[model samples]
Target: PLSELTISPHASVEVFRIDTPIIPESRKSLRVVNTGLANSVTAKFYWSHSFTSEWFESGSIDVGLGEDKVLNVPSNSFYYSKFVIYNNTDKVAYVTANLV
Candidate 1:
């Protein structure tokens, strides 16, 4: 089963730069959707356990115009990892997340 995951649509202060809010306990996975306006937004997601003090990336993911990307969490180990999003596009990229 899955549920809607909240996200912030704030513009990137710098290209490929965005802030991630603290994960709510209920979140387990992310279904990312690109609402529109860019041909595509190339993004890379990373996670780091607060105590580990290191970030491991999930590689590059592209959210094309009006497209969705479903990413089930790699494992419960991720629960300890703080999440971050890197949107590599000059145009504003509108996106939302769903937890699964």
Candidate 2:
């Protein structure tokens, strides 16, 4: 289960540059919109250290169509991270969240 991000209309990805030069920078934040639409979506973030055949999931976020809100996830490690969105509803849910 995801626990830091949420979904909204006009789904978008936000990549942030954290002030940490150690490892894992870029936190993610999401916004919720389209209240009249009933759709459910789940997002999972994963990353790899170098270019190995292994992807480790660090965090995830899920949301339902109802209210507007913001969600954010802290940075960890990985030069690049990704978000996989799962559409559980037939309303075609979209998100326009950003990273911070």
Candidate that would win on TM-score: 1
Model 2: per-residue Cα lDDT over 4-100, one tens digit each: 3334444543333233334655655544343435465665665555557775666656666664555554454446555555555545454444443
Colliding pairs, model 2: 2-60, 8-94, 10-95, 11-95, 12-95, 24-76
- lDDT value, residue 43 of candidate 2: 54
In angstroms, give how far residue 55 of model 2 lies from its true place: 2.5
- Number of the predicted model whose lDDT against the real structure is largest: 2
Q: TM-score for candidate 1, please give it.
A: 0.56
Off by over 4 Å in 2: 1-38, 69-71
TM-score of every model versus the real structure: 0.56, 0.54
Error of 1 at 69 (Å): 1.9
Over all chains combined, what TM-score does candidate 2 have? 0.54
Please give, for residues 1-100, the per-residue lDDT of candidate 1 as tens digits.
3323222344331112223335523235556677765556544445555456666766456668798886544543343333344445565656665444
The regions of model 1 sitting more than 4 angstroms off are 1-27, 42-45
